[PDB]
Amino acid sequence: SALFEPYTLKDVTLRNRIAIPPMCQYMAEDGMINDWHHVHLAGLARGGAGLLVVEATAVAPEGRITPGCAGIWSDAHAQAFVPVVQAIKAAGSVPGIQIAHAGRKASANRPWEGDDHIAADDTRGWETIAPSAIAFGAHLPKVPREMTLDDIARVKQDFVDAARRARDAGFEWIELHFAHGFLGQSFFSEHSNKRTDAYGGSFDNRSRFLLETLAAVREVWPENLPLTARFGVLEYDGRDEQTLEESIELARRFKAGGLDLLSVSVGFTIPDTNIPWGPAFMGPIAERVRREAKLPVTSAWGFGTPQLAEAALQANQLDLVSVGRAHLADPHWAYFAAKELGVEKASWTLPAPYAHWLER
Amino acid sequence: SALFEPYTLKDVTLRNRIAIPPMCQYMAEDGMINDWHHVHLAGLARGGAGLLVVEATAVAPEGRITPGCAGIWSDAHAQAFVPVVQAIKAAGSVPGIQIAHAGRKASANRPWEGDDHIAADDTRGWETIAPSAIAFGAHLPKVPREMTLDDIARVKQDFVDAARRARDAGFEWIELHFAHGFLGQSFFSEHSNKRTDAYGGSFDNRSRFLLETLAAVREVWPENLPLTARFGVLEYDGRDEQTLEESIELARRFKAGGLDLLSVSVGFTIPDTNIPWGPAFMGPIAERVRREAKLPVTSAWGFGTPQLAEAALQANQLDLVSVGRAHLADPHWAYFAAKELGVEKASWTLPAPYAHWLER
């Protein structure tokens, strides 16, 4: 099975091609993770996936999505990850982390607590920042503050500090969150970036925040550990071909700047879109980016059956298959997939205290 | 669905009728549990089951099955359970524990490391104890030492101390392990008990160790928390009707001595048997014990599909359905069962950070 072939990137070898993508848990307190995250992540790692990427972890307090988001904006925050990293490694999975800044989509309620911008008089809320003072709209109506050049310098340094902390906590894989309408994505998109300084207007200027952040992170992140990013390559906003062409050009510049793999997603920059959700719907677009930028990729949003996953790999659409919600339903999804694909000794996807009893 | 109806026993209410039975992990070191057990148990509790019973936990070092077995023979051992108990309660499951003594089946290898008695020159092994100096046979050829009256008094006190420690660690449900050919079961069976003192020969004498241990434990275990036992009610050894009649009589004496629920199992006292393994095969025998002893019961050994479980409850064969291996395969089996039985808001079997995303 392609799904169960190992994958090597830089000095890191994954035991199979199943990746667990970052999935916010909304269970942290002032950015500090706790036993929710410890058990959640260690349990997933034991389930058999080759790579486990920790949820969007804010580089600064105002870059959380919600009051429940994880953070890594101080050394105390980073140290809270150390036992979890150690538990993920003990299970034989590779520990990764997504470092993030929510931009204009920050200061929101948890998804089961309204999913909307926090009310102005709620003591939990805060001012958001963005390239330009323009609201997302819909359920996120708060107008963000337009960043100064000093804000841009500060947030870049926060990404550097976050990467340094992730390194020193023992993570073996990092992902810069430049997708999903958050700060990085919003610098790239003309919908959200109306700046007329060096960080807006032209393709080079809109790209600048992302490329400078990548380069700054590259200075502290070890050259022997994968350096990756998530990026929304189209919006489904009626501008898809032009947007995909620019996104591919940016992917080429990421590769030239030391990016080892790109997680290909949708932008979610604005609400007025028509995303054609369906099984493996991102496969052809991931494949195009992989081919035209000559860069390894993963994607998600509907690959969560063993057959979809296997087919995407065999077609060389993807290098790793990210499987999210299926792992919330069943932390041992990788074992389920091994059985379904007829892998020999499928139960030994799991550790011995489970595998011995499940051998059929 | 019957499976998702709550159950109250003494002061404890279970949120549904799914019980996770004790399942040895073989991951402890000198009896001390560790992050293997913490993550395993907390993850299971979050999966939705109403009751989670911790694995056979030895009341004395020589009562471990293997060098990897959990123990509760000192206060330090008990304190290691406190954070796990607290994590199980945080998830809304009821924490229970099975306290045990392996008798002549002790000093064995882990099941994936030979599953047999430890060799005489292996530094890990130890002398076993039993009612009579008679080996199990087959892969367990070691002849145990015949217990003195002082040994009987000591082991009873070890069960009392273990129950006191379990109470003080915060467990809300206790199970005395009088099944599976271990010490208690071996006192009851004429195959293994050839004593001619007060603890062998007659039904009353063979019962005596079990009834005295129950009574001694009852003195320290709170009257408002369920007091339960696991007991092998037949062997499939060609003596089934007579054995089941005696077992039912003992179950009546357990009920009169304060037992709240009986986990009905097979004896596994000797190797030369013909157990008719099959789906829900224990259902009719559990039902007979329930009816003839007028005592709530659970059982296991093949009820691990949502339909088998539901049918057993609706037929009043069982009060709780124990589901073991299916939970090793999928820690979220209770969610799977809720979906399969068409329970409303099935995803909310799981905590919010999973349930919100799985609502279909």
Ligand SMILES: Cc1cc2c(cc1C)N(C[C@H](O)[C@H](O)[C@H](O)COP(=O)(O)O)c1[nH]c(=O)[nH]c(=O)c1N2
């Ligand atoms: C609970 C939860 C939380 C998050 C997510 C999703 C879900 C379900 N997703 C998106 C996620 O990584 C993935 O792309 C989607 O779940 C689609 O893949 P599946 O169809 O679920 O396999 C997400 N994406 C990301 O880049 N950072 C994150 O922290 C989050 N948070």
Ligand SMILES: Cc1cc2c(cc1C)N(C[C@H](O)[C@H](O)[C@H](O)COP(=O)(O)O)c1[nH]c(=O)[nH]c(=O)c1N2
């Ligand atoms: C890994 C593992 C370990 C154990 C068990 C089994 C397995 C699979 N079983 C028996 C268990 O509680 C249950 O009766 C069986 O698993 C049968 O139920 P299922 O068919 O698996 O649902 C078991 N029984 C018990 O009374 N004490 C224990 O600690 C153990 N240990």
Ligand SMILES: O=c1ccc2ccc(O)cc2o1
């Ligand atoms: O990047 C993110 C963070 C949270 C999140 C939550 C839900 C979803 O569908 C996507 C998401 O992306």
Ligand SMILES: O=c1ccc2ccc(O)cc2o1
């Ligand atoms: O009571 C026990 C302990 C370990 C154990 C292991 C396997 C099994 O099938 C049953 C068992 O019963």
